[PDB]
Amino acid sequence: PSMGTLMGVYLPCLQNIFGVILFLRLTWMVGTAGVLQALLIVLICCCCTLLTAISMSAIATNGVVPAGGSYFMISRSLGPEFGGAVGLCFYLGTTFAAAMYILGAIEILLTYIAPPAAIFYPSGAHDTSNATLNNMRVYGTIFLTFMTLVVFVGVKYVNKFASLFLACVIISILSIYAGGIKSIFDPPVFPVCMLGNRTLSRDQFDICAKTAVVDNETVATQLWSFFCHSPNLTTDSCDPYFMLNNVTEIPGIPGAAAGVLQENLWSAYLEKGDIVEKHGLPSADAPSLKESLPLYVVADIATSFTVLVGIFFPSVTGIMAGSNRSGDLRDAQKSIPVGTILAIITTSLVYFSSVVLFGACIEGVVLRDKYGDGVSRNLVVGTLAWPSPWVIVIGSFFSTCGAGLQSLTGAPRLLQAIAKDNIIPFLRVFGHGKVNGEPTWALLLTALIAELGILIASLDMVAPILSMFFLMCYLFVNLACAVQTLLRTPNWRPRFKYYHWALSFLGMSLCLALMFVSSWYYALVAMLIAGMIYKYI
Amino acid sequence: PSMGTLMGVYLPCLQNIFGVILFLRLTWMVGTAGVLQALLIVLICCCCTLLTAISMSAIATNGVVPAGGSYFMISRSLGPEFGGAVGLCFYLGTTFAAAMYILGAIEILLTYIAPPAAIFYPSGAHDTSNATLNNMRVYGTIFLTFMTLVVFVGVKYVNKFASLFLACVIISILSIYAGGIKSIFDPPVFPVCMLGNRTLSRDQFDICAKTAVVDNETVATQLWSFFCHSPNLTTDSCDPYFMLNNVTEIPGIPGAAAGVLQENLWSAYLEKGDIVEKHGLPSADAPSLKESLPLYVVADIATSFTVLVGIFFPSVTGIMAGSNRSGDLRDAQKSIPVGTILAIITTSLVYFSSVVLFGACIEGVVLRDKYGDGVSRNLVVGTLAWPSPWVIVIGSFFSTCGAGLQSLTGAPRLLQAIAKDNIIPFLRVFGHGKVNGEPTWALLLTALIAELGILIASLDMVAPILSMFFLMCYLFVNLACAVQTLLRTPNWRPRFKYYHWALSFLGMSLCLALMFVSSWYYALVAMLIAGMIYKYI
Ligand SMILES: C[C@@H]1CC[C@@]2(OC1)O[C@H]1C[C@H]3[C@@H]4CC=C5C[C@@H](OCCC(CO[C@@H]6O[C@H](CO)[C@@H](O[C@H]7O[C@H](CO)[C@@H](O)[C@H](O)[C@H]7O)[C@H](O)[C@H]6O)CO[C@@H]6O[C@H](CO)[C@@H](O[C@H]7O[C@H](CO)[C@@H](O)[C@H](O)[C@H]7O)[C@H](O)[C@H]6O)CC[C@]5(C)[C@H]4CC[C@]3(C)[C@H]1[C@@H]2C
Ligand SMILES: C[C@@H]1CC[C@@]2(OC1)O[C@H]1C[C@H]3[C@@H]4CC=C5C[C@@H](OCCC(CO[C@@H]6O[C@H](CO)[C@@H](O[C@H]7O[C@H](CO)[C@@H](O)[C@H](O)[C@H]7O)[C@H](O)[C@H]6O)CO[C@@H]6O[C@H](CO)[C@@H](O[C@H]7O[C@H](CO)[C@@H](O)[C@H](O)[C@H]7O)[C@H](O)[C@H]6O)CC[C@]5(C)[C@H]4CC[C@]3(C)[C@H]1[C@@H]2C
Ligand SMILES: *[C@@H]1O[C@H](CO)[C@@H](O[C@@H]2O[C@H](CO)[C@@H](O)[C@H](O)[C@H]2NC(C)=O)[C@H](O)[C@H]1NC(C)=O
Ligand SMILES: *[C@@H]1O[C@H](CO)[C@@H](O[C@@H]2O[C@H](CO)[C@@H](O)[C@H](O)[C@H]2NC(C)=O)[C@H](O)[C@H]1NC(C)=O
Ligand SMILES: *[C@@H]1O[C@H](CO)[C@@H](O[C@@H]2O[C@H](CO)[C@@H](O)[C@H](O)[C@H]2NC(C)=O)[C@H](O)[C@H]1NC(C)=O
Ligand SMILES: *[C@@H]1O[C@H](CO)[C@@H](O[C@@H]2O[C@H](CO)[C@@H](O)[C@H](O)[C@H]2NC(C)=O)[C@H](O)[C@H]1NC(C)=O
Ligand SMILES: [Cl-]
Ligand SMILES: [Cl-]
Ligand SMILES: [Cl-]
Ligand SMILES: [Cl-]
Ligand SMILES: [K+]
Ligand SMILES: [K+]
């Protein structure tokens, strides 16, 4: 066995922690919560995983570290009762992470790469959401049935091209920082058209002006016709908000400055149906017609602190996939505690610096545009990139398509290993495999469980379920590291310097509080199920 | 043993089938779906239960009919594998039916009896729903903790006053029919104020007129001030829909006629946010301000056929609670098949005649008012009653409060009987009881599971879950009546004239199709769970 700390523990952790939400939902989170509460979300979500890594270091520095996987380490160091729960919650987390990584790639393909490749269209006037959901479901079934046949046939080709999907992530992050440094000197040009406080969708109309001049004559623009329903300049059929207020362009990226970071510093939560608005603009109060409501950037979902925590939390998960090479290492009780902790530190520094960067460079109206309606249907992340916005689009699409394949290769192996362990004979038929050892019936069950997450068809609806499963897994790891100390069991003597039972209790309580924060209802259901299984045994 | 067919089988079935949805969601269903599709919903939902009663008659006409409950009949006539599934699905159905019956009584109390007894108020302008949900949850916890202490202390007093809650239902139905016959000759006076096609909420403004006369002077009314935001008659700040259109009262109950039944005959489905509108009125097309949108009757939820089936279906359930007295009967193989089938026939005739009655008497704009906003916050059912609308309000409130108590007494006995059977030792601690035999730990588990249904806080959100559990129970009964015939098992010779295996197959397929109709997602999850338990055994 010869695998270092770098290519054995650190690089798979750093490949599994970075993902879809850094490129799709982090600018929206900064713009919705403010820089201060966004740093609070990043700090709270990166203390569950740091204390969980301190507990996994106490797992790794005990005994012999049996070869293969993180399931076998926990199962041989903590008994079959805790290990089965950890393995089952981590299997369910990986199978729904595959669904979230597929839905991210479909969102990138349908809203940024190929917009006219849409089957279902928003008929009528309103409900542009049901066509979006039915459009996500069809491409979800197609990409899931393709990427399960790829895993069924081409495991060696997925394992051979596993570092290319990490190179894509690193290039598409260095482009963000290279453009964010350029914006100090030479910011790019993305004009945002507004009307009073309200920002409007630039994709529909042509020119951001109330009147224009053609043939030495003042003619009402296309923007006049959407609000007043006549090409005549002296009608009284206009809404009184459009009449009293003036139409103004602003720079969507004003560059890195202190006055920009000062305005993006506080929370601006909106309910579903509200319009994204500035604060430092004059606006005359007047009622507005209901028929001009599609001519604005509108909050898609209702937001709060507890909504944003549950959407952010699957950015930080990925500790447990740095112990999968625990048989190939030279010194497995040295490479795992150093590697997982340094990977969590570097990824959390990237998240803090990116929160401060997006808060100081991009203006909060562009930040609060989920799907980028204020700027010509572009990525808000992509507008800040240095060479072109297409770098982040292509790199994020290939990174999500790679992270879905790696989850669809990682979860059937885990169900294979749990079934072959005879720990629950109810799953005995899922230990059947090929002559290679590759699973056959576990891959089908992962494709069926990840289909139930695709049929939810939203990134923001699937992500709290992922938070709910990974927080249960990380809670059982901290339970199993505190109980074995407090019960004074034999064969539990961790040789790790920075381990103490109070840190595992603190991690258990923190990953229990985040369970109530992300979604209180299903946490209250899982608490009943867990309190019932305890009354059994 | 001496119990007849009438007081032993027929009256408990007829007490358990009638309930909350006949008085709260049936007029809304008629107005939303039309008379033809409402009769289709009633006909489809009353063929799952009729074929399920034909299968329960084949259960009852086999063997000895062991004493006590419907669980023991199925468990001794079909084996412990089918019987455990039937008993567990029927237990979960009864524990969520208690939650639906509590939420119905809270809806009646907060919207019709005591409106100012509300803790949470709709602050701001919009979101009158979140205050409503948080207002349902608090009174749900209060009424659940009261009606579990009543069941823990006063079982004999709940059993002594069980016929009073049936007398309330029968009086409050005979009042509906007595007023619906009066409306042929002398219809009551409930004026509905409208403005073009759109109907408005009468509870806010005073007089249904655009201008009025005080002191020999024409003065703008209170209804003018809500739409134009000025008491001056010559302003141009009005919305152009209010200016071009005229304000008109109609009779909310025009009486039983053929021209009224002809207009309520077709479907009018609305999406969330649409305004309830007539069809036979002139209306000038004009845009409308967003700030006048609370001055209208608005569809609360989006409706379709599959939404209304899942809300109607728990009106028909209640077959299985006519075999609870199977030890007290004289001829249990005669009283059960006659009693359950005659009770299903009489309740289904009441539903068909009530659909035709509400379609022919009440106008469809009043029918499509869920919560009765068009007529002064009254029950749409209650406006048709003969003596007063308070009869239906008080009778429906006491009937839902009684049907919640009877579910909270029926489900702990079932969990008691399943736990004492040693069929699943995982539930062994729930067979502990008092010295009387009354359960202690099963009553707590019913209070905890019915709390998870109360915290959903909607009648229309809890009702498809009830449909999902009762359709699984009725599917397992038809499976277990077709498999024992087709496998040619011994000790299965039903002596019922009208039984055949094709009727049980037809009932199984119909109660499987309704499972996909009511909610396709959770049916698709339950199909995976059932197909996995089959791959185990
Ligand atoms: C050990 C062995 C391994 C395999 C196995 O066990 C044995 O493992 C277990 C694990 C099981 C799974 C455990 C958990 C599960 C999650 C569960 O979802 C619960 C709720 C969510 C799903 O929502 C549903 O989504 C469907 C599809 O949309 C809806 O159906 C609708 O579909 C159509 C639309 O066209 C229409 O008819 C209706 O809309 C409806 O029928 C369901 O209704 C819906 O419940 C998460 O959804 C939640 O939805 C909320 C919306 O109200 C949302 O709130 C917010 O919504 C928006 C944000 O988008 C905002 O406006 C507001 O902020 C909020 O309103 C919530 O965010 C969101 O959480 C499904 C089952 C599943 C997967 C288990 C399956 C079995 C399992 C794998 C077993 C196996 C056997
Ligand atoms: C044998 C032994 C006995 C005991 C035991 O096992 C062992 O038995 C089992 C049985 C288990 C139970 C099985 C089933 C269960 C149902 C499951 O619910 C699934 C979905 C529904 C719940 O929705 C959730 O409701 C909560 C509360 O609202 C939401 O949380 C929200 O709360 C706040 C609000 O302030 C806010 O933060 C967010 O809103 C959110 O956090 C959840 O998000 C939500 O998922 C049904 O809800 C569905 O919601 C849809 C809305 O999107 C709705 O679609 C339609 O919505 C409206 C209609 O109102 C319309 O506009 C449209 O037409 C649609 O959008 C759907 O109609 C609706 O179906 C919960 C678990 C439970 C009870 C199991 C518990 C465990 C159990 C008892 C075991 C035990 C151990
Ligand atoms: C929108 O912008 C215009 C600028 O064109 C403001 O118009 C005022 O115009 C008069 C004469 O045209 C000037 O003397 C004033 O100085 C302008 N006011 C300013 C610059 O504040 C108009 O008031 C603006 N609308 C607003 C602020 O609601
Ligand atoms: C944007 O402008 C509006 C008025 O042009 C600001 O004023 C609010 O308007 C709403 C109407 O939707 C009222 O309910 C509020 O009471 C108004 N607030 C006041 C007068 O302080 C609105 O605040 C502005 N948006 C910002 C600053 O984010
Ligand atoms: C609303 O109702 C009024 C009735 O007061 C309609 O007014 C018209 O008024 C003129 C003179 O006042 C009459 O000669 C017409 O016969 C009326 N038209 C009718 C009765 O159709 C007014 O047109 C109505 N608004 C509509 C239908 O949009
Ligand atoms: C009620 O009146 C309106 C117009 O006063 C009718 O017309 C529809 O108006 C909507 C605007 O919300 C348009 O989108 C439709 O195209 C109009 N339909 C037409 C012109 O046929 C509306 O149909 C009426 N409602 C009814 C009859 O239920
Ligand atoms: Cl991610
Ligand atoms: Cl992980
Ligand atoms: Cl009912
Ligand atoms: Cl029933
Ligand atoms: K991740
Ligand atoms: K019922």
What DSSP letter does each residue of A166-178 carry, written as one string? HHHHHHHHHHHHH
The amino acid occupying position B508 is M
Q: Are B321 and B294 in contact (CB under 8 A)?
A: no
How far lies A531's CA from each of A25, A93, B241, in Å?
35, 21, 59
Give the C-alpha separation, B198 to B236, whole Å. Answer: 22
Q: Give the length of chain A.
A: 537
Q: Are A418 and A87 in contact (CB under 8 A)?
A: yes
Q: Are A242 and A292 in contact (CB under 8 A)?
A: yes
Helix (H) or strand (E) holding A57: helix A26-60
Give the tokens for residue B384: 């048709």
Sheet holding A198-199, edge to edge: A198-199, A191-195, A247-251
Residues from B in contact with A at Cβ < 8 Å: 126-127, 229, 236-237, 239-240, 271, 273, 287-291, 293, 426, 429, 448-449, 452, 455, 521, 524-525, 528, 535-536
Contacts of A4 by beta carbon, 8 Å cutoff, 6+ apart: A330, A335
Measured between beta carbons, which residues in chain B are less than 8 angstroms from residue A524?
452, 455
Place of tokens 């970071």: A261
Ligand 6 closest atom vs CA B241: 5
Give the C-alpha separation, B107 to B201, whole Å. Answer: 19
Distance from CA of A303 to the nearest CA of B (A): 14
**Residue A345, Cβ neighbours under 10 Å: how many?**
13
Helix extents (H) in A362-455: 364-367, 390-420, 441-454
Taking CB atoms and an 8 Å limit, are A528 and B290 in contact across chains?
A: no
**Residue B234, Cβ neighbours under 10 Å: how many?**
5
Atom 27 of ligand 4: nearest residue by CA position: A279
- Whether B135 is in the pocket of ligand 5, judged by its Cβ within 6 Å, is no
- In our burial notation (b when 16+ CB lie closer than 10 A, e otherwise), range A482-492 reads bbbbeeeeeeb
Taking CB atoms and an 8 Å limit, are B524 and A426 in contact across chains?
A: no
Closest-CA residue to B384 (of B367, B363, B361) = B361
Closest-CA residue to A526 (of A450, A477, A466, A469) = A469
- A279 C-alpha to center of ligand 4: Å? 9
Contacts of B28 by beta carbon, 8 Å cutoff, 6+ apart: B367, B368, B369, B370, B380
Q: What is the largest CA-CA distance in chain A?
A: 93
Measured between beta carbons, which residues in chain A are less than 8 angstroms from residue B289?
239, 287-290
- B523 C-alpha to center of ligand 2: Å? 14
- In our burial notation (b when 16+ CB lie closer than 10 A, e otherwise), range A252-281 reads bbbbbeeebeebbeeebbbeeebbbbbeee
Give the C-alpha separation, B4 to B338, whole Å. Answer: 11
- A75 C-alpha to center of ligand 4: Å? 59
Give the tokens for residue B1: 């043993």
- In our burial notation (b when 16+ CB lie closer than 10 A, e otherwise), range B304-337 reads eeebbbbbbbbbbbbbbbbbbbbeebeebbebbb
Contacts of B444 by beta carbon, 8 Å cutoff, 6+ apart: none
Closest-CA residue to B445 (of B397, B409, B485, B412) = B412
**Residue B204, Cβ neighbours under 10 Å: how many?**
12
Helix (H) or strand (E) holding A514: helix A501-518
User: All domains of chain B, ordered by start, with CATH?
Assistant: 7-186+300-536 (1.20.1740.10), 191-292 (no CATH)
Q: What is the largest CA-CA distance in chain B?
A: 93
Ligand 2 closest atom vs CA B95: 78
To test the pocket of ligand 5, the residue of B243, B246, B248, B281 to mutate (highest count of ligand atoms within 8 Å of its CB) is B246
- B245 C-alpha to center of ligand 5: Å? 9
How big is the CA angle at A348 (ends A345 and A350), to the nearest 5 degrees? 110
Helices B130-153 and B441-454 sit at what angle, rounded to 10 degrees? Answer: 170
The amino acid occupying position B355 is V
Which residue in chain B has the smallest CA separation from A455? B521
How big is the CA angle at B303 (ends B299 and B309), to the nearest 5 degrees? 135
Give the tokens for residue A372: 């980028």
Taking CB atoms and an 8 Å limit, are B287 and A236 in contact across chains?
A: no
- Whether B525 is in the pocket of ligand 2, judged by its Cβ within 6 Å, is no
- B322 C-alpha to center of ligand 10: Å? 9
Distance from CA of A15 to the nearest CA of B (A): 32
Q: Are A12 and A322 in contact (CB under 8 A)?
A: yes
Give the C-alpha separation, B423 to B71, whole Å. Answer: 12
- Whether A196 is in the pocket of ligand 4, judged by its Cβ within 6 Å, is yes
Give the C-alpha separation, B192 to B366, whole Å. Answer: 8
Contacts of A453 by beta carbon, 8 Å cutoff, 6+ apart: A95, A96, A98, A99, A100, A462, A465
Which residue in chain B has the smallest CA separation from A524? B452
**Residue B458, Cβ neighbours under 10 Å: how many?**
16
Strand-strand pairing, A217-220 and A211-214: antiparallel
- Whether A285 is in the pocket of ligand 4, judged by its Cβ within 6 Å, is yes
How big is the CA angle at B175 (ends B174 and B179), to the nearest 5 degrees? 115
Q: In chain B, helix, strand, coil percent, each to 5?
A: 60, 5, 35
Please name the member of B237, B293, B452 whose beta carbon is closest to the beta carbon of A525.
B452
Give the C-alpha separation, B277 to B268, whole Å. Answer: 9
Ion ligand 7 residue ranges (Cβ < 5 Å)? A 19-21, 315
Specify the resolution in Å.
2.9
- In our burial notation (b when 16+ CB lie closer than 10 A, e otherwise), range B149-175 reads eebbeebeebeeebeebbebbeebbeb
Q: Are B271 and B302 in contact (CB under 8 A)?
A: yes
B318 is in an annotated binding site: yes
Q: Are B415 and B81 in contact (CB under 8 A)?
A: no
